[PDB]
Amino acid sequence: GSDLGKKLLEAARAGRDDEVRILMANGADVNAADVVGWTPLHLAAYWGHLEIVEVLLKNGADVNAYDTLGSTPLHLAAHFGHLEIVEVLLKNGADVNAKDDNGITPLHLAANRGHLEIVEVLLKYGADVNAQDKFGKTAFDISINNGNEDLAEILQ
Amino acid sequence: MPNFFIDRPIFAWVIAIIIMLAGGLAILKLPVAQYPTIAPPAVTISASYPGADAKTVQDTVTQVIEQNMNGIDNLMYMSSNSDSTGTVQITLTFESGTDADIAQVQVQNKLQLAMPLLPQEVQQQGVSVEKSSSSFLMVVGVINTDGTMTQEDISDYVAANMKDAISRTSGVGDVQLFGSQYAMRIWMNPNELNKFQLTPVDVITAIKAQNAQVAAGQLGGTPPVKGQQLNASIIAQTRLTSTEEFGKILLKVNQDGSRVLLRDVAKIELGGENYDIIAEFNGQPASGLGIKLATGANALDTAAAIRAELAKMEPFFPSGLKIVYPYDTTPFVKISIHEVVKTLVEAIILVFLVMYLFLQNFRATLIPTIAVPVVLLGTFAVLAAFGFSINTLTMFGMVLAIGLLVDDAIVVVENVERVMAEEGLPPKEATRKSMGQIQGALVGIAMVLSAVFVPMAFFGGSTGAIYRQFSITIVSAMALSVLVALILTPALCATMLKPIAKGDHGEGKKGFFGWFNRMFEKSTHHYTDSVGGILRSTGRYLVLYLIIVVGMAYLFVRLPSSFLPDEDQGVFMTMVQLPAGATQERTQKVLNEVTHYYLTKEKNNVESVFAVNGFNFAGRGQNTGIAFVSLKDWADRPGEENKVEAITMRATRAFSQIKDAMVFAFNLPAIVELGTATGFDFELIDQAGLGHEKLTQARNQLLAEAAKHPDMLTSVRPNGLEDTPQFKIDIDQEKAQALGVSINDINTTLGAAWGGSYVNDFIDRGRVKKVYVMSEAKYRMLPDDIGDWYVRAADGQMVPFSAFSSSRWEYGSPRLERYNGLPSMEILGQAAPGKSTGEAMELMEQLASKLPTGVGYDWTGMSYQERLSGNQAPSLYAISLIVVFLCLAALYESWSIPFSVMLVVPLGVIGALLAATFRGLTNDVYFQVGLLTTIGLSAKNAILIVEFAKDLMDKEGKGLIEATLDAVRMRLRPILMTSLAFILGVMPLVISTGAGSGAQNAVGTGVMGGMVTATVLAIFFVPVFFVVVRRRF
Amino acid sequence: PGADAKTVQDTVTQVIEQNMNGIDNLMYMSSNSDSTGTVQITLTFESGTDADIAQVQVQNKLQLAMPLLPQEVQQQGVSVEKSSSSFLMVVGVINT
Ligand SMILES: CCCCCCCCCCCCO[C@@H]1O[C@H](CO)[C@@H](O[C@H]2O[C@H](CO)[C@@H](O)[C@H](O)[C@H]2O)[C@H](O)[C@H]1O
Ligand SMILES: CCCCCCCCCCCCO[C@@H]1O[C@H](CO)[C@@H](O[C@H]2O[C@H](CO)[C@@H](O)[C@H](O)[C@H]2O)[C@H](O)[C@H]1O
Ligand SMILES: CCCCCCCCCCCCO[C@@H]1O[C@H](CO)[C@@H](O[C@H]2O[C@H](CO)[C@@H](O)[C@H](O)[C@H]2O)[C@H](O)[C@H]1O
């Protein structure tokens, strides 16, 4: 929503660590969203750029910020398997039980793609294992349907 | 042989006449086009999968086709792009010299076979296979000025009335429509569809049922009951013809007795096949005709006929329809012909003036005036013999050769005039002696000149084809010229020339000519004395000579090489590129500005701007665009500030002020193909199944690591588009089955409403057009709209998409490249200031090796051709040298003497190099072809000085120095003349502005400088050369 | 199949013919459309024309037409070949 805002959006999704630093020095927006409601935090989370996420979070970026479809950066991180980014977000205040418009939590997505390490971490930060999507499925359900034996053990 | 025709001038006249007759004939039956075919044969397969994403297209269509492209002959490479608009193109590119017809049929025969492997909706749309030719003869724009016609309305009209006639017109090979004909459009309304429990599926079923072609049979058909008196055809239901009918299509009979019509749940109108591309011409709606010349045709004739046909159409146009002509190569090509007939006429005139000045004789003024056209005539014939076209390249190949044509006439005649004026012989016995003095050298010259040009025909690929035009034109012109000078001129001299009595050097004559005759006869002595002095001290000049060779070498290196020089072509483009997710609305906002600039801030130079939204040289899409800007005549745009290259940077600057767009402008290249010298074309390749994300990454790495060498690599860039947000909708199979909803009903509802669907055909006013079902736009814009669509479940209950789907944002590709079968990413860039391309390439190659495992790379396009076909330039010129030496050695009966002549070469080159580098020009093709002709003449001039000199020694028993002086004295005059005539001859081209200027400049300014130096230097250096060589051995 | 002459022309003959222009050495082009549902389009080439190359070129242009043609006409197949029109002979077969 500004010359630098958009510029920052570009920089975060490509992970130009330095250009981010500068824009950060310059006061570029941390709430600059594109047409789908993604902020540079989302972009950095989806694309796995740890330094940026840490940087943006220091500069007051919204960690529970949410796309036009209800999805917070934690979702994107959990789903796309970036352990380190998940830990940071969580440690920095992220909602672990955030439900997108479909009722899908970050636990759900990690479960589906079978990133167990991410699951434990989310479990450790107290993710509701019993929470269910619009279709009424738990992350355990996701696991048995996908036939992940190891993952279903954890989710008990 | 010259003595044969000296006693038989009738025979010579016959031969002469026969040459002219063939030539005149061949001038008529010879094709005219701008450039001949240069690019090696390419064939493009194109299909469209209505409503598909780049991956869907690639994975259901592109791969299947690529997978079936085997057994085809003479492939070099195969590239394909699959994009977000539903379209794939696959380009197979064949070896140079492959029959394009054969290549095209082979490609299509394989596609045919692969066809049943493609989705329904794609075989239904078909997949077209064409030749790749980025050469339009012209583009006819068709606009509506009184605003009563949408671009669809225009397009349809153009199709229904204008297109077929233009197709049938003489000389036109292919015609392309810049729009689509009408299409029956059913614009669904999901709200209505719900109150009557209807899905898109019923709407489609109804349409296939009621808009159809039913076979019946015959009354009284065979075998009949005998005694049958009548046989008639039974004619059943036929195709629908109107919107009224389509709207009367019956969907449902409600239980209460009510009727549900297609128009009850839809809006129905004649519309377009697709709406991806918005064409505007100076802000008004627009359509067009992209027209291409046919094989062996004549651009000029064809263009004329195209215009005359549109004329015949004018009376019937609806209100405010108008033809305009935003692209026409034809006025251009006209200029090129005019300018080269001029140059060939001017030169005869210059030669007449010179011939008369020095020789002071009218009967002699005629000999070259006959011989030169006769040679130019028969040249045309031999050009037709190998079936070349009158084109930009062969025409300039003539002007370049004009010097040698002129020379051979000048030479043969002058030497007869000299022999009389020195010995008091009769014309007949004089020519017999004079021809006897030069005949062997002439045969020799024809060989030596062959070995200079003929090698150039042998270069490979695109460039080779270009050289080949010049190489062949110039070898034939040369060889006729030598034949003529051995058959015609000898006879013409012997029978046309006024006697001269011994010693009469016209020194005792009138005013101007007596004074000239003495000022010249004197300057001949100064010259003589100069060479005598020069010969007393040869070391001084072997040193001077080594300096010019170094200068030549140094100059050469520091001269930028190009292919063909840019040209104000009457038009130029400008690219706009909004970012990811930008609507076509927004793109039009920019385009209207770009149009605004050119119409306001360049009222002077711009006649029109054709704005095309949705299309772009990097890709297709709602967020791309291109604007074709057409300029007023060159006569209305004078002075470098009003030529294309100015307007370019000025417009590029103003557009850098555009907030959220990437807008620049640029001029088209000469020949539409070869891109950039110093420029390269790179393919990054997935050789191990890594996928998109990993490949984008290897690309990123290679780009970033190339940006860290701005001294070799400059402007290294991706050719394709970047990933963009996508809307991923997941169907819940479980809940679908549990509610009694079908998968196919769900999916067909999604895709038909949101993507469109080609149902079948109908007939509109006698023409067969398509029928499309889609949602009215206001129900297919935003994600919230998805659940506004209802699908019927087996139990007859209406269920909203919101109940069995889930949606999320995720990034994916809107354009996916492949190269020789595998996923790829195209990379462009050029060599940095002053570096070669093979250097920049070698670094890219080196830099690429350090990429992640599984990533490979290939060189395509011009780079492919370089990596295999530039290395010949030495090897070929080594052959030249060897043959040249060999011929000379044969000529002079000496392994040693040839060096005396060969040494002349840099004397020509240095001026040319000075002259180019001066002006700020380049080492482009014209320049190089000009070098060869410069070198040719000087080599010739030399060959004669040496031969005469040597002759005097061997025959009259003269000393080395005595003969070199005498030779150089004799050979002084005809060298001055030829040069004098030629330097003037090329002067017009040297100073030309606009209108095919850039070309004329290139051929001219490098011939001028080179002729200056090769004349001055050779009259001093050649005598030295002979003497030192004869001394050393 | 089953289509009248006007239909067979509007939906097939026209479509093909309008894609049939711009071919090397094409003197003239006759065609007809009967009531069985049959289209026959004949292109005649300047004497000297390589017949096999001529065929290929027509093959190539016909491709561009194929998809625009009705579904059921492509289902029948559409052939492209050098042709004659004169019977060299008629071999008769009878039973004695
Ligand atoms: C009337 C007399 C005048 C006649 C003059 C014309 C004759 C010219 C001969 C045509 C040459 C054809 O071009 C052909 O190209 C290949 C290129 O892969 C050359 O092959 C080359 O391979 C490597 C390439 O890395 C070169 O370094 C090498 O110098 C060369 O041998 C051939 O040597 C040549 O024969
Ligand atoms: C064709 C168009 C342009 C015309 C003029 C352009 C400029 C070039 C002029 C010609 C140069 C040669 O001019 C000639 O040079 C030699 C020197 O090497 C001179 O010769 C003299 O100098 C040398 C040494 O210094 C002596 O060994 C020699 O014995 C002596 O006579 C000649 O007296 C002079 O006539
Ligand atoms: C009496 C014998 C006569 C023999 C003398 C030799 C002739 C010299 C002049 C003609 C030059 C021919 O052309 C020579 O090779 C190529 C031709 O594409 C030119 O330009 C360039 O072409 C290729 C391909 O695009 C590039 O890879 C290369 O970097 C570059 O050399 C050069 O500018 C020129 O040096």
From Swiss-Prot, chain B:
Gene disruption: observed consequences: Loss of susceptibility to contact-dependent growth inhibition (CDI); inhibiting cells still contact the target.
Protein name: Multidrug efflux pump subunit AcrB
Record family assignment: Belongs to the resistance-nodulation-cell division (RND) (TC 2.A.6) family.
SUPFAM superfamilies: Multidrug efflux transporter AcrB pore domain, PN1, PN2, PC1 and PC2 subdomains, Multidrug efflux transporter AcrB TolC docking domain, DN and DC subdomains, Multidrug efflux transporter AcrB transmembrane domain
Main location: membrane
Regions that span the bilayer: 10-28, 337-356, 366-385, 392-413, 439-457, 466-490, 539-555, 872-888, 899-918, 925-943, 973-992, 999-1018
Organism: Escherichia coli (strain K12)
Subcellular location as annotated: Cell inner membrane
Curated annotation (Swiss-Prot), chain C:
Knockout mutant characteristics: Loss of susceptibility to contact-dependent growth inhibition (CDI); inhibiting cells still contact the target.
Induction: Positively regulated by MarA, Rob and SoxS transcriptional regulators (at protein level).
Cellular localization per UniProt: Cell inner membrane
Disulfide pattern: none
Protein family membership: Belongs to the resistance-nodulation-cell division (RND) (TC 2.A.6) family.
Subunit structure: Homotrimer, with large domains that extend into the periplasm, interacts with AcrA and TolC. AcrA may be required to stably link this protein and TolC. Interacts with AcrZ. Part of the AcrA-AcrB-AcrZ-TolC efflux pump.
Chain's role: AcrA-AcrB-AcrZ-TolC is a drug efflux protein complex with broad substrate specificity that uses the proton motive force to export substrates.
The protein, known as: Multidrug efflux pump subunit AcrB
